Amino acid sequence: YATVSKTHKTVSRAYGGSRCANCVKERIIRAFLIEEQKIVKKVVKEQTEAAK
Amino acid sequence: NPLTHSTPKNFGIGQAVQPKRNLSRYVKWPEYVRVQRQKKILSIRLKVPPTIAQFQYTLDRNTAAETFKLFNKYRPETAAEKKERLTKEAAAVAEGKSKQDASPKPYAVKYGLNHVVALIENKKAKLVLIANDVDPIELVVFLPALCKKMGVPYAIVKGKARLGTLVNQKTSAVAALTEVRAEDEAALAKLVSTIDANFADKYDEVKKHWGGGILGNKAQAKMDKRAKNSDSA
């Protein structure tokens, strides 16, 4: 592999020659939702604290 | 403000890597460090017999400072001062015909353990300083008793090195005065009194008091609190 040009060792996506693409779809979706649900989680317990 | 943001980190178990902190309380010291520290601890956990326990009581930093101030006027000759004196007599005496008495009677601090002991036994010392480090303590432990029975006023003082500096050695274990200029007789009488009040007078009472027996501080806590609730409900 050292004897061979960089384009033989990647595909041009995030996580190119490392994870498998359907795998990166999953990573992205899950990241987005979980980062969203975080705002959802916070605002509930900000509400619990003031309604108690 | 600008295009700059607040993003406060959360260091509360299960997220964010803990930041760098002062772990000095936790470092795994070299054995020689661990050993010299434990030598201290072990030396306090035990009940320490009165005749060793009477050290630890040391001249207070005021009386001390005053006592080094006096003793410092009586430093022994320096190499040069003596090279100076010899030629000032070796020439002069041998010729103008003094009796090896074209030199003045020297006044100095007397030192060396063996020296001072003989001085004390002959009631020549007027004031003796005993260091409080002295690791074979035996070199020195008999000296409060010694001075006391010989009626000689003494003081346990911080600094073997400090006794050293006043005598041009690295250390010195003891320092004493047998002689004094008249301009100083009075300063000394006063010093001896504060000192005699703090040691020789107290000696017979100190002889009855074991030291040590001190818990470490996690065990103090444990007991200052166990014995807070137990009784006083």
């Binding site: - | 760098k20 002062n22 772990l23 000095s24 470092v27 795994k28």
Partner: protein, 121 residues
């Protein structure tokens, strides 16, 4: 005041000053001369019938050469001793405890010529 602050709980051996040697006397009086000059490197021509042939046909000088010498030392030696240019040097150890160097000269030189200048045949 107050103590240092160590953020590592590991205590490592202090980085300490390493003086260089400044001897009070010399290690050995006189340095040894060159243990392997060219004359000790290339010891004697090898002139077997079949060595001779390599010379006439392959522009190759064949030398018995020091056991202690490598392809570099043989090359340099031949060069310096013979005013000649070496393409490449092959070597083998003989079954009598000695080293043979097949030394190919470059095409500017004529090993045959250059062997009966050194004086053999």
């Amino acid at each position: 005041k107050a103590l240092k602050v160590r953020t590592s709980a590991t205590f490592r051996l202090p980085k300490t000053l390493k003086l260089a040697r400044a001897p009070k006397y010399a290690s050995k009086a006189v340095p040894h001369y060159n243990r392997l000059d060219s004359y000790k490197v290339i010891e004697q021509p090898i002139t077997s019938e079949t060595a001779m042939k390599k010379v006439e046909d392959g522009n190759i000088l064949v030398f018995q050469v020091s056991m202690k010498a490598n392809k570099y030392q043989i090359k340099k030696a031949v060069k310096e001793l013979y005013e000649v240019d070496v393409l490449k040097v092959n070597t083998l150890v003989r079954p009598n405890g000695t080293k043979k160097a097949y030394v190919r000269l470059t095409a500017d030189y004529d090993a045959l010529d250059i062997a009966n200048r050194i004086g053999y045949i």
